[PDB]
Amino acid sequence: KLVPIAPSRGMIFDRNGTPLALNRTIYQLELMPEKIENLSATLNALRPIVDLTDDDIANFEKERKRSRRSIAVKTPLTEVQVARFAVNQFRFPGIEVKGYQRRFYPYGSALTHVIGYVSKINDKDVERLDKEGILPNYAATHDIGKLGIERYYESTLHGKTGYEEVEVNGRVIRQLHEQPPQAGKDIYLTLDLSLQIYIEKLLSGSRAAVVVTDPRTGGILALVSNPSYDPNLFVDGISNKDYQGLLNDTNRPLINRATQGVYPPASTVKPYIAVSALSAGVITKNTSLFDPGWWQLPGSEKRYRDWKKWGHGRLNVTKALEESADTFFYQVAYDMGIDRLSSWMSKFGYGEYTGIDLSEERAGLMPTREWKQKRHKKPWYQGDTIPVGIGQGYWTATPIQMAKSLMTLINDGTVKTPHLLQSTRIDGVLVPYKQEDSTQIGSINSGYWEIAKDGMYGVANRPNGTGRKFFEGTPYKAAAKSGTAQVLRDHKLMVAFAPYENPTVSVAIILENGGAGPAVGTITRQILDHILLG
């Protein structure tokens, strides 16, 4: 008499409006078994009209008792079967066609980690929706957001259950009144579908993560974890066997490497350590030391080796960044101390959730003395300080944390929250994302940001630059910084931004245990070229 009308789930779009998450119509035939005269005769009559198989009966027979107590006689119907039922409606008074919506992901595994998936509501979801006091709003709703955007914006994408006053027999005949459902709100993402597809291609067979951001907005133009899987098979109610196949793959397709991969950031951190050392005044632009290719922990027999076996010689910070000198940063770490260095890296967001609008995230670890006492029950030694100076030791970060620290550097200490939401459709208007956070590290006019970035310019462009090979011929100027994180094979890391002059793209990439094939600087150049040439 008064019944719930399920609202349709909001759609998800890329930055140009390409649909990424769609609803499809599934037609099924339904009746109330009691309100039927000759059920067993009626079913035999339906065989020819909607191609009703023995298995359509079996699956209905199994449902009639299992149902507390309408049941699906046949599910799914072809339009042809619906059309043959509709002209024979008068012959089956107690039987109607019902239209339902099932989520569809047309680019599948290219966007599994970003978009996620919706899955069938289970007892645990029911309990939790009860506790939250919104279970009535899920009365006609089958699926809910379990990963990615589908999860983080579940409340935006779901909408409002409506009500209809209807008359029966025992199938609906007409509608007395209707309180419309309000459709879920559509979400437009910052994602560039073309860039995303292109990057999943480049990573093929690598365990990898890439984050591409626009540093003027903090919008995420691409977010790739490789290896991936088909999100569609979770809408289909994933089997135990398929889930276990995913859960036990050693490549770990289930893990979003971009937001849950925790790795040593290695030498990618040296630009932020420079800015911090300069701002704390522990060095100046000019502060020079001589590198013989190793460094003695002063007052102790520990030797720390530079990557360059016979050293870089006389280094200022600029040259230490261009050549990725370890010796210069071992000194800077020693002088700064863990307390000031941990505190400054925390300002860059290391050890912190980034604020990205996904619920699948790890914070990693910006080590402190307090933390080491707490976790490992020993106190902090000078030994512990030194590897932290080159982004190793207890220091772990996510690719999304590395993307955020770079955006902060590009914007001279003005922090952008990385974000996937470009706009929400509210009442037929696209309402843009607005950053709520307004953090500022040191002073915008310090010119210390510039020293660190001129360093990175040098890595890419100057003949002593460690990355000069990857960026030969560019019509734009790129700024970059690489790193190698050992654990068999070392992880390879690069961060980069372009036009150096006025950056419109920044990239953070890690190839786990090196590239399956290509080098991280090859891949970074291919990404910057894709966006800035074409």
Binding site for Br ion (CB under 5 A): 8, 181, 183
- Closest approach of Cβ 8 to Br ion, in Å? 4
Q: Which is nearer to Br ion, 183 or 409 (CB)?
A: 183
Give me the least distance between CB of 32 and Br ion, in Å please: 25
CB nearer to Br ion: pick between 53 and 182: 182
**Least distance (Å) between residue 160 CB and Br ion:** 9
Report in angstroms how near the CB of residue 180 gets to Br ion at its nearest.
Answer: 7
Residue 228, SS3 per DSSP? coil
Q: Answer whether 526's CB lies under 8 Å from 202's CB.
A: yes
Nearer to Br ion, 180 or 292 (CB): 180
How far apart CA 269 and CA 10 sit, in angstroms, is 40
- 348: tokens are 């860059």
Name the minimum Å distance from CB 425 to Br ion: 13
Q: At how many degrees (to 10) do helices 520-532 and 193-202 cross? A: 160
Q: Give the span between the Cα atoms of 473 and 482, in whole angstroms.
A: 19
What are the tokens at 456? 């990175």
Active site residue 267: yes
Q: Which has the closest alpha carbon to 322: 442, 482, 197?
A: 482
User: Rounded CA gap, 71 and 28, in Å?
Assistant: 9
| 294 φψ region: left (φ > 0), alpha (ψ -120 to 50), beta (else) | beta
Minimum CB separation from Br ion for residue 485, in Å?
49
Other beta carbons within 10 angstroms of residue 402's beta carbon come to 33
Rank residues 118 and 199 by Cβ distance to Br ion and give the closer one: 118
Q: What is the 3-state secondary structure (H, E, C) of 345-393?
A: HHHCCCCCCCCCCCCCCCCCECCCHHHHHHHHCCCCCHHHHHHHCCCCC
Rounded Cα distance, 308 and 266, in Å? 16
Q: Which is nearer to Br ion, 11 or 496 (CB)?
A: 11
- Residue 8 vs 232, nearer CB to Br ion: 8
- Write the CB contacts of 145 (distance below 8 Å, at least 6 apart in sequence): 116, 117, 118, 151, 152, 153, 154, 157
**Chain-centre distance of CA 64, in angstroms?**
42
Residues in a beta bridge with 209: 225, 510
Q: What is the bridge-based pairing of β-strands 187-189 and 12-13?
A: parallel
B/e letters for 312-350, b = 16+ CB within 10 Å, e = fewer, are beebbbbbbbbbbbbbbbbbbbbbbbbeebbebbebbbb
Give the torsion through C-alpha atoms of 99, 24, 26, 151, to 10 deg: -90
C-beta closer to Br ion: residue 154 or 384: 154
Find the catalytic residue in 70, 119, 225, 267: 267
- Tokens 């996620």 belong to residue: 116
Interatomic CA distance for residues 510 and 501, integer angstroms: 25
Segment (H or E) for 344: helix 326-347
Residue 89: count of CB within 10 angstroms of its CB: 12
Tell me the C-alpha to C-alpha distance, in Å, between residue 490 and each of 398, 408, 485: 16, 27, 5
Closer residue to Br ion, CB minimum distance, 70 or 161: 161
**Minimal CB distance residue for Br ion:** 183
- Measured CA to CA in angstroms, residue 189 lies from 202, 475, 517 at distances of 22, 29, 31
* Nearest to Br ion of 154, 230 (CB atom): 154
Q: How far is the CB of 10 from Br ion (least distance, A)?
A: 10
Name the minimum Å distance from CB 163 to Br ion.
Answer: 13
- Work out whether the CA dihedral 416, 420, 424, 425 comes out positive or negative: positive
Closest approach of Br ion to the CB of residue 182, in Å: 7
Q: Return the number of the residue (185 or 319) whose C-beta is nearest Br ion.
A: 185
> Which residue bears the tokens 């790795």?
263
Minimum separation from the CB atom of position 118 to Br ion (A): 16
Q: Name the residues annotated as catalytic.
A: 267
